[PDB]
């Protein structure tokens, strides 16, 4: 009651090939749903469309979410990663919760009363058997703050289940979290547990210096032949076959061992407002995968370059993680109030999102039938394809749980990060019913492992830097109101590798 | 040595894995026309949120589909796999522009993509994919 149940740890220790990052924050937990499990469905909120239909529950339990990078890395630390390293991946997670303080409010007339409640408890437990839904993969808000001095609020835990419209079905599952053995903490207890990440492939934080189709030697001729001329000239019965040697003169036709990865085309919209069509094509014209008669928008989509080299005004409609600048409203914000990330780096080995994958010959030529081709809008995996996965921005997610299923292909999640079949367990918390809320400290520590840049490239790399032009306020810092603002999203890919 | 057979129906659908009470930090493209200024083009973003769940960015997508014809007279896996009589979804055929409307077309067959998950229902060869028989 009178002695600190834990200490304050925030720092980063760069040791050899490993990195140890520790983040500590101060949180507040209110009471949700008046200590009740409450059913929720769109019928409560008006239930406009069948696409948006959901059936689920809301629990008083709150949960801790550290799933975003900027929780762990200060901007400068992050810089020391993207600049010097060709890869990273988490090894150990060590979580601590302590210094619980339970407060109670008896409101009398205008001024409310707040004082310590000593005998109150705060229940906390983790789901390490994965019997509960896993909501930490969808990039929800409520995570630890980017800036240490920010005191935050634990999000409310909710989940959804099978449904037809707002009605339920027999197979819908209802989980009571009280049914779980959980630790109970008074103002002197603390909570701690450690976690060992399962083996995941290094995330790549390098940009290929070569393009998939230029891997050739420019000085030498292949020994493969291609068909140059099917006629000599104009006339009657001019058909002929003329093979040439593929070589540096014409490089488009050479035989190649590998081909770019999969593509599902996104509609491309311009940031100059007037190059866009004068109609509402936001939902009607967007790409979307359909499931059980419910249409789903394809966001962010498979990993594909955002635009052709040299044109940057345009962006794929849903094909890009779109963050937002601080102060950005929650509705109908302008084009510049959002920060639209673009995959410039992965264009070399991956198809462009807003372009076709290619052509196919759609009929059989004869004297009476021309060769007819048609575009490939969507292209799935073929033998030989190589591709790069989406980058992880400093604001983006770290991991996501792989839905437990029969099979999967390349589980790495589409918003970035590390797909895992046993991700870091959820951490649930609530105030035991006895008006009540609790507060305290949370320190989370992940140990990251590195892959150093070994390359022999002669000229200097492109590195991430901070400008020097006398701005009113420094980037990644506070304004005069103490508002920590992250001005631009930071890719992980600066150093270069060969293809 | 074969994988343990799965004999259960998933409680939740693939697209609904979200937390219904909390917004994502990601934005989607809500509104492409003003409508007040007599259809001046405009570009507006809004938070993907539980109010509109169709638009939220998802980490995984349903498995492959190769369409069949519906005849009138496997419904348990309808969570992670598309309906055999319905299109997999839409793609955009052309670039929009001021003089051309955005066009979309149906995906009748869809191969594997990175990030697909699916539920189920060997030759001697150089390669196969997911050998589990049909």
């Amino acid at each position, epitope marked *: 009651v009178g002695s600190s149940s834990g200490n304050w740890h925030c720092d980063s220790q760069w040791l050899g090939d490993r990195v140890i990052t520790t983040s500590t924050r101060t949180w507040a937990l209110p009471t949700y749903n008046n200590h009740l499990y409450k059913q929720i469905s769109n019928s409560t909120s008006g239930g406009s469309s069948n696409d948006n239909a959901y059936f689920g529950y809301s629990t008083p339990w709150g949960y801790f979410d550290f799933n975003r990078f900027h929780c762990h890395f200060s901007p400068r630390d992050w810089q020391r990663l993207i600049n010097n390293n060709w890869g990273f991946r988490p090894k150990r997670l060590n979580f601590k919760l302590f210094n619980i303080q339970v407060k109670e409010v008896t409101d009398n007339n205008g001024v409310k009363t707040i004082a310590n409640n000593l005998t109150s408890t705060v229940q906390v437990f983790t789901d390490s058997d994965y019997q509960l839904p896993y909501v930490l993969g969808s990039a929800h808000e409520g995570c630890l703050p980017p800036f240490p001095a920010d005191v935050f609020m634990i999000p409310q835990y909710g989940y959804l289940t099978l449904n037809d419209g707002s009605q339920a079905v027999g197979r819908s599952s209802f989980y009571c979290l009280e049914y779980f053995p959980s630790q109970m903490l008074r103002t002197g207890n603390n909570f701690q547990f450690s976690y060992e990440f399962e083996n995941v492939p290094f995330h790549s934080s390098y940009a290929h210096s070569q393009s998939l189709d230029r891997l050739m030697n420019p000085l030498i001729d292949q020994y493969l032949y291609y068909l140059s001329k099917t006629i000599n000239g104009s006339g009657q019965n001019q058909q002929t076959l003329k093979f040439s040697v593929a070589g540096p003169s014409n490089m488009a036709v050479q035989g190649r061992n590998y081909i770019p990865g999969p593509s599902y085309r996104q509609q491309r919209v311009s940031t100059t407002v007037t190059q866009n069509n004068n109609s509402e094509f936001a939902w009607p014209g967007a790409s979307s995968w359909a499931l059980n008669g419910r249409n789903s928008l394809m966001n962010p989509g498979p990993a594909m370059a955002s635009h052709k080299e040299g044109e*940057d005004r345009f962006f794929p409609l849903s094909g890009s993680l779109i963050f937002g600048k601080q102060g950005t409203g929650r509705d109908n914000v302008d084009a510049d109030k959002v920060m639209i990330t673009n995959e410039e780096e992965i264009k070399t080995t991956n198809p462009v999102a807003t372009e076709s994958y290619g052509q196919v010959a759609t009929n059989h030529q004869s004297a009476q039938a021309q060769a007819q081709t048609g575009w490939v809008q969507n292209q799935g995996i073929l033998p030989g394809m190589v591709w790069q996965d989406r980058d992880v921005y400093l604001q983006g997610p770290i991991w996501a749980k792989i839905p437990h299923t029969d099979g999967n292909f390349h589980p790495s999640p589409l918003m970035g990060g590390f797909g895992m079949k046993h991700p870091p367990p959820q951490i649930l918390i609530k105030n035991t019913p006895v008006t009540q809320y609790s507060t305290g400290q949370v320190s989370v520590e992940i140990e990251w492992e590195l892959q150093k840049e070994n390359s022999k490239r002669w000229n200097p790399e492109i590195q991430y*830097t901070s400008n020097y032009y006398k701005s009113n306020n420094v980037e990644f810092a506070v304004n005069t109101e103490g508002v920590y603002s992250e001005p631009r999203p930071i890719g992980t890919r600066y150093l270069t590798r060969n293809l | 040595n074969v994988p343990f057979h799965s004999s259960y129906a998933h409680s939740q659908s693939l697209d609904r894995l979200m937390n219904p009470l909390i917004d994502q930090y990601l934005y989607y493209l809500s509104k492409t026309i003003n409508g007040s200024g007599q259809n001046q083009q405009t570009l507006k973003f809004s938070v993907a949120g539980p109010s509109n769940m169709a638009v939220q960015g998802r980490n995984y997508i349903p498995g492959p589909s190769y369409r069949q014809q519906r005849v009138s007279t496997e419904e348990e896996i309808k969570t992670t796999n598309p309906v055999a009589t319905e299109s997999y979804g839409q793609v955009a055929t052309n670039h929009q522009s001021a003089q051309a409307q955005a066009q979309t077309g149906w995906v009748q067959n869809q191969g594997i993509l990175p990030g697909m998950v699916w539920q189920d229902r060997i030759p001697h060869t150089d390669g196969n994919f997911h050998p589990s028989p049909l």
Partner: antibody, heavy 123, light 105 residues
């Protein structure tokens, strides 16, 4: 508030490249998310657009000018440079720098303008 | 390109008297416009963006409503502070074009 200053030579020999630079104070080109563009005012005549450059480096040029103009974006020093090649007597006017965008009208109407820069092409 | 022609080339109208300047786009611009004001020798400054939406800096007196092939800038209660040329701009399609100029007196 966004103050825009142009600098460079005020006299250029004919068929010598022309170079001006606009150093924007009050915003950060990398994180402002607005278009930056040039126009030119041949004396006593209507202004004609030259081109603009989006903050990521993409560029639009005016076809009337025939592939002479090139707009380079130096983001670290927070300034962008106009370069027009093979200058002639006809290509002499006051060159304005401008911020091409706003919330609703980004890359359309020029809200904030340079002080102006006189360039006289002569032999 | 799309031409822009402001109908009065030189409109001499003194203080207090209402003035209206009209510029017609060669082809429909879908109400995308931008009237500007240039006092002699200084760079121009924006006045009305889109069709009728006033800029924050500019005084309430300036106004104008385009039908999309027709546009007018009505300077109401003209004060002596502004005698300047006036340009209009299309935003509809590249390249952006500023027609002529309307010098007012």
């Amino acid at each position: 508030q966004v103050q825009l200053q142009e600098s460079g030579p005020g006299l250029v020999k004919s068929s010598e490249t022309l170079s001006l630079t606009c150093t924007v104070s009050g915003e950060s080109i990398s994180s402002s998310s607005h278009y930056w563009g040039w126009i030119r005012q041949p004396p006593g005549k209507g202004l004609e657009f030259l081109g603009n450059v989006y903050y990521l480096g993409s560029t639009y040029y005016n076809p009337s000018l025939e592939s002479r103009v090139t707009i380079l974006l130096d983001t670290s020093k927070n300034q962008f440079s106009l370069k027009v090649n093979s200058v002639t007597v006809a290509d002499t006017a006051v060159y304005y720098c401008a911020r091409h965008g706003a919330g609703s009208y980004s890359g359309l109407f020029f809200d904030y303008w340079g002080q102006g820069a006189r360039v006289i092409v002569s032999s | 390109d799309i031409q822009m022609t402001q109908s009065p080339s030189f409109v001499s109208a003194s203080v207090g008297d209402r003035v209206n300047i009209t510029c017609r786009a060669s082809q429909g611009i879908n109400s995308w416009l931008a009237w500007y004001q240039q006092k002699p020798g200084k760079a121009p400054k924006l006045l009305i963006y889109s069709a009728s939406s006033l800029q924050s800096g500019v005084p309430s007196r300036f106004s104008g409503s385009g039908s999309g092939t027709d546009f007018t800038l009505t300077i109401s209660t003209l004060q002596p502070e502004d005698f300047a040329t006036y340009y209009c701009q299309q935003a509809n399609s590249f390249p952006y074009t500023f027609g002529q100029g309307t010098k007012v007196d």
